[PDB]
Design a protein around this ligand. Structure first.
Ligand code: BCL
Ligand code: BCL
Ligand code: BCL
Ligand code: BCL
Ligand code: BPH
Ligand code: BPH
Ligand code: U10
Ligand code: SPO
Ligand code: FE
Lengths: 281, 238, 301
């Protein structure tokens, strides 16, 4: 039940709500007030998904799907079986997410470390609430949100995108993808650097941050440094998710035509709109 | 066909990999213990890995993990309930006793060394050619704690030589003695440094270093430990 | 309460010329400038870089790749600066039509230039790969970087060389242009039945997303424990301190299991490497073995 060095930290304190009432663990798990909140919302949510499954008639998880109220309902409620379940499941999801974040804050306070983790998580929560709450509200219908099923939500990704031609031309989407890819590069390098120092050539002694800096300067003329790379992964990560949210918040609301056509502004600038030759004259 | 052969092999390779990765992250804290320090009954489904040995750079030795485990130190805590799963109350003063968010580990009582074998961290005064290069220089600013009372003055910055960064502020007390505050737990404002983890009376309580041009890993832990703990434990005085 | 995203004080000393190990020092340049800007975030020191032969081969064919694509773009612009800038994203250097199969006999102005550019790229990438191994060897370090980079090379190899070969033609490879390569990509998906049905594609995404997940976790964790020297990961690996302890414990209390300071880097190297590993099989199998991912997916084989 405990890691060899763990007891000294399992002290009272740090709770945000409830004082010492739920200040306890279950095996490895800390139970906030917010542990209880997440269990409550996740349990409900799961039950209503199992329910929604029988009303649709499968117990197979590759097929189970929960659609939002069809466009016809706008922002109102809708009967359980025609997307009310989705509405309650969504509210449950949000409850479970924010709860999990808030539980994290309490774990942070007990450990006396910074709030960076829940703060990062908060960007993912915010991406979710863009697909399910902010976009559908700026659009006028829960129907625009995505449904809850392994394969069916991909269907939504493809339908939503192709509504704008090749979604590649969404410029905020370009930027986000750029962050996702860079993030992965950074991750591969960070892991390979640290590990290449802790596990050097063989019988050789552990290398040092000095070596890690050296290797990167030797390689590209620059090394960001051990604090830097951690600041970086964070920033690349979160920026990817920011631009994801941003690229979808603007689609269907401030831009709704073919993303390819947005680029006409640059090509049709006065100073060059008319010169002949090239691809656009 | 070839593709269903590939995808199915991959799922297997990926199970192998999770296995390797999961055991690999057991080289520390394992085996699991009950609240009383005893080997727990149920260990999980992953075995410990065969040990590995890192060779440490400066005739500094070896580490072989997994190996026999222990805090090499007392733990001023006691049980507050009658079964597994609840908190353990500090038996004395948790800051002074280094438990809870004031905890520190029995890290090695020498200093981290650079790649050249020299101390990685030095007070700026002993660091040849090193000066403050951007941002407000804190040296000379009064240090104010969360009670809004002045607890001393900044007298040097301790720097990481190979990585060229601030790591501590050395702060002087009414006493005339000094203490290290971790660079990451201070606000350098224009006319003061602000330290929210501690109130003025807890500065004396900061663990002290045995020599004024070195810190040992152990001392660093007791220092960082102490000041982080203040966020929970100073908060009455705050 | 301060957050360690930007430094409050920068500190500079003598420029760090770095560890001499078995490195041939004849080949390191001298230090570059120090950037105060960069130094709010990470290291302020630029340089020194090491260049020697393989380095130069690489830097040279890199440039040659780039200038090949570059003259064609200016050509496509009919030598007019205004047009060039306007239509920058629309220019495109396409490979040979399917009629030339794999032969190098295509006219310069209709795909020969593509093969030339591709040739320069091939040697730039591989020589750089070698540089990746050799800069490690000289420092006595393990070979992880080179192995990880090899994963990236795999996808890139498959896209532009291995897959066009098994397919019988270069027309199958990816053009050089900002927009045209996005088109190639959407079009590739379409022709193969929608890559959402390609289970290697789906894995690929899980890893891509998973990388953003991990690095956000990892970065955040380290910053959170950086008030106990958490970022000095190597020395936390050789002698666990409270930073490594409280980071393990946060995860363990949150999700019920956790990593070690060294183990987390293995999670990282693999999460990222798996994106392209995965992805490369995904593409490699397309058109060579599966002609339609929807279809293949219906019989699961
Ligand atoms: C993976 C499937 C597709 C693909 C799909 C996309 C999509 C979709 C997008 C990009 C985008 C990018 N791709 Mg592409 N891209 C492919 C393969 C490549 C290759 C290659 C194999 O050599 C290159 C050099 C590029 C280059 C680029 C850049 C124009 C841009 C940012 C990449 C990045 O951040 O890297 C990491 C870091 C670097 C430091 C290198 C920067 C290189 C410059 C030149 N792509 C393959 C063929 N690529 C994004 C973009 O903005 O397009 C305009 C975008 O939305
Ligand atoms: C044919 C389809 C279109 C297309 C249409 C779209 C559409 C439409 C969308 C994207 C979005 C994205 N696309 Mg695009 N996209 C295309 C081509 C690409 C290509 C490519 C190589 O060609 C790439 C790399 C990308 C990349 C991207 C990203 C920028 C983004 C997805 C990540 C994200 O938003 O995370 C955000 C992360 C989350 C929302 C996860 C949230 C997690 C929550 C908080 C917690 C869940 C916990 C869980 C329930 C608990 C599990 C229990 C455990 C088991 C215990 N697109 C093609 C052209 N793309 C999406 C986007 O930008 O979203 C804003 C989006 O909506
Ligand atoms: C982000 C932009 C798009 C999107 C586009 C895609 C695309 C495109 C793909 C996926 C894929 C996945 N997406 Mg999706 N997906 C979206 C939002 C979500 C949300 C959410 C709560 O917002 C969730 C939970 C998921 C979950 C999933 C998984 C079933 C799968 C692997 C993801 C992954 O590894 O991430 C990284 C995270 C980890 C590695 C952590 C582990 C996460 C685990 C696996 C989540 C389990 C979800 C569970 C099956 C459903 C919850 C039910 C519970 C009982 C409550 N997607 C939005 C709508 N998603 C891939 C797939 O393969 O689908 C078949 C794929 O190609
Ligand atoms: C509408 C378009 C299609 C689609 C078609 C494709 C195609 C086609 C491909 C992908 C690929 C991918 N797609 Mg898809 N994709 C779609 C929708 C999505 C969505 C979504 C809808 O939300 C997402 C999240 C993704 C995500 C992804 C990635 C997981 C994967 C690319 C991994 C990568 O790192 O590449 C980037 C990394 C590289 C290209 C490696 C390059 C490394 C080389 C060696 C370095 C070159 C640098 C060079 C020298 C220049 C350097 C200059 C510097 C400045 C010095 N796709 C839809 C269904 N997708 C790729 C894949 O693997 O699929 C299985 C791919 O080929
Ligand atoms: C840049 C931010 C990146 C990020 C960061 C991030 N994620 C995080 C964190 C952070 C910092 C955590 O601290 C937290 C964690 O604990 O990690 C282990 C987490 C987390 N991110 C997770 C998933 C997740 N993150 C993703 C993405 C991202 N995470 C971003 C890329 C994705 C993607 C890419 O799709 C997924 C799938 C979980 C592992 C964990 C959050 C666990 C949690 O919140 O638990 C509470 C809830 C439950 C246990 C049960 C579900 C509740 C019910 C209401 C039912 C189902 C809801 C429904 C929407 C299902 C949808 C169906 C699908 C088929 C589509
Ligand atoms: C694990 C998969 C991820 C990955 C890993 C990765 N890339 C790498 C490496 C690794 C491990 C290196 O070691 C190598 C490097 O030097 O990193 C700085 C590299 C590299 N990845 C690069 C680019 C790159 N990687 C990409 C992607 C990815 N790389 C994946 C997300 C992409 C994308 C997303 O499209 C790009 C554009 C280069 C920075 C570098 C290879 C340098 C090279 O081969 O260049 C020759 C020289 C020239 C072209 C100069 C002329 C240009 C003016
Ligand atoms: C260096 O430092 C660091 C560490 O440490 C030294 C670390 O460990 C970690 C942690 C990272 C790892 C361990 C590597 C693995 C990372 C991933 C691949 C992330 C993917 C996550 C999963 C696949 C699992 C997520 C599981 C969750 C969210 C828990 C759900 C589990 C259940 C089945 C039950 C949930 C219980 C509830 C409802 C909570 C409330 C409590 C009550 C019971 C009441 C990081 C990041 C790190 O940087
Ligand atoms: C001022 O202008 C100057 C003169 C400096 C020149 C400017 C040039 C410009 C603007 C060049 C731009 C180049 C671009 C847009 C390059 C982009 C390439 C892209 C987007 C993607 C490439 C994918 C390539 C792949 C997958 C290639 C693989 C190749 C092989 C495996 C080689 C096999 C060959 C035989
Ligand atoms: Fe790290």
């Amino acid at each position: 039940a405990l890691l060899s060095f763990e007891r000294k930290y399992r002290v009272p304190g740090g709770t945000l709500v409830g004082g010492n009432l739920f200040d306890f663990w279950v095996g490895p798990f800390y139970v906030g007030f917010f542990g209880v909140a997440t269990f409550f919302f996740a349990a409900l949510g799961i039950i209503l998904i199992a329910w929604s499954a029988v009303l649709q008639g499968t117990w197979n998880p590759q097929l189970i799907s929960v659609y939002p109220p069809a466009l016809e309902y706008g922002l109102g409620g809708a009967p359980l079986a025609k997307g009310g379940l989705w509405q309650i499941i969504t509210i449950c999801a949000t409850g479970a997410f924010v709860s999990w974040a808030l539980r994290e804050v309490e774990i942070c306070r007990k450990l006396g470390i910074g709030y960076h983790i829940p703060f990062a998580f908060a960007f993912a929560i915010l991406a979710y609430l863009t697909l399910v709450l902010f976009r559908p509200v700026m659009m006028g219908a829960w129907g625009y949100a995505f449904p809850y099923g392994i394969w069916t939500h991909l269907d939504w990704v493809s339908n939503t995108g192709y509504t704008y031609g090749n979604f590649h031309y969404n410029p905020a989407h370009m930027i986000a993808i750029s962050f996702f890819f860079t993030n992965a590069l950074a991750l591969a390098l960070h892991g390979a650097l640290v590990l290449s120092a802790a596990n050097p050539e063989k019988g050789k002694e552990m290398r040092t941050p000095d070596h890690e800096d050296t290797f990167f300067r030797d390689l590209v003329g620059y090394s960001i440094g051990t604090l830097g790379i951690h600041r970086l992964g964070l920033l690349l990560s979160l920026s990817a998710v920011f631009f994801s949210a941003l690229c979808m918040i603007i689609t269907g609301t401030i831009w709704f035509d073919q993303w390819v056509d947005w680029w006409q502004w640059w090509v049709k600038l006065p100073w060059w709109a008319n010169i002949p030759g090239g691809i656009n004259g | 066909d070839l593709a269903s052969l590939a995808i199915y092999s991959f799922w297997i390779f990926l199970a192998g990999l999770i296995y390797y990765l999961q055991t690999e992250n057991m080289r520390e804290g394992y085996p699991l213990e009950n609240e009383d320090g005893t080997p727990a009954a149920n260990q999980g489904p992953f075995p410990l890995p065969k040990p590995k040995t890192f060779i440490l750079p400066h005739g500094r030795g070896t580490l072989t993990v997994p190996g026999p485990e222990s805090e090499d130190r007392p733990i001023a805590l006691a049980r507050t309930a009658v079964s597994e799963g609840f908190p353990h109350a500090p038996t004395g003063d948790p800051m002074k006793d280094g438990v809870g968010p004031a905890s520190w580990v029995a890290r090695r009582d020498l200093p981290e060394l650079d790649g050249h074998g020299h101390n990685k961290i030095k007070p700026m005064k002993a660091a040849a050619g090193f000066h403050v290069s951007a941002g407000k220089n804190p040296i000379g600013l009064p240090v104010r704690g969360c009670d809004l009372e002045i607890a001393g003055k900044v007298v040097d910055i301790w720097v990481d030589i190979p990585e060229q960064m601030a790591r501590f502020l050395e702060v002087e007390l009414k006493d005339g003695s000094t203490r290290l505050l971790p660079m990451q737990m201070v606000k350098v404002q224009s006319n003061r440094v602000h330290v929210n983890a501690l109130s003025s009376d807890l500065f004396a309580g900061i663990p002290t270093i045995k020599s004024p041009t070195e810190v040992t890993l152990l001392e660093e832990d007791k220092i960082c430990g102490y000041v982080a703990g203040g966020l929970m434990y100073a908060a009455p005085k705050r | 309460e301060y957050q360690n995203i930007f430094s409050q004080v920068q500190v500079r000393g003598p420029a760090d010329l770095g560890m001499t190990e078995d490195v041939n020092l004849a080949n390191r340049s001298g230090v570059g400038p120090f950037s105060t800007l960069l130094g709010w975030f990470g290291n302020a020191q630029l340089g020194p870089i090491y260049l020697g032969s393989l380095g130069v081969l690489s830097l040279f064919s890199g440039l040659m790749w780039f200038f090949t694509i570059g003259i064609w773009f200016w050509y496509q612009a009919g030598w007019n600066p205004a047009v060039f800038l306007r239509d920058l994203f629309f220019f495109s250097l396409e490979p040979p039509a399917p009629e030339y199969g794999l032969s190098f006999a295509a006219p310069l102005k209709e795909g020969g230039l593509w093969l030339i550019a591709s040739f320069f790229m091939f040697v730039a990438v591989w020589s750089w790969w070698g540089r990746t191994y050799l800069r490690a060897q000289a420092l006595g370090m393990g070979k992880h970087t080179a192995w990880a980079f090899l994963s990236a090379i795999w996808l890139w190899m498959v896209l532009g060389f291995i897959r066009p070969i098994l397919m019988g033609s270069w027309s199958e490879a990816v053009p050089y242009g900002i927009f045209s390569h996005l088109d190639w990509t959407n079009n590739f998906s379409l022709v193969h039945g929608n890559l959402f049905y390609n289970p290697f594609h789906g894995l690929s995404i899980a890893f891509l997303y998973g990388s953003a997940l991990l690095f956000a976790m990892h970065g955040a964790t380290i910053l959170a424990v950086s008030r106990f020297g958490g970022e000095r990961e190597l020395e936390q690996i050789a002698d666990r301190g409270t930073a490594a302890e409280r980071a393990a414990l946060f995860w363990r209390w949150t999700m019920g299991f956790n990593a070690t300071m060294e183990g987390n880097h293995r999670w990282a190297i693999w999460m990222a490497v798996l994106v392209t590993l995965t992805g490369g099989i995904g593409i490699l199998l397309s058109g060579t073995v599966v002609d339609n991912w929807y279809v293949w997916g219906q019989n699961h084989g």
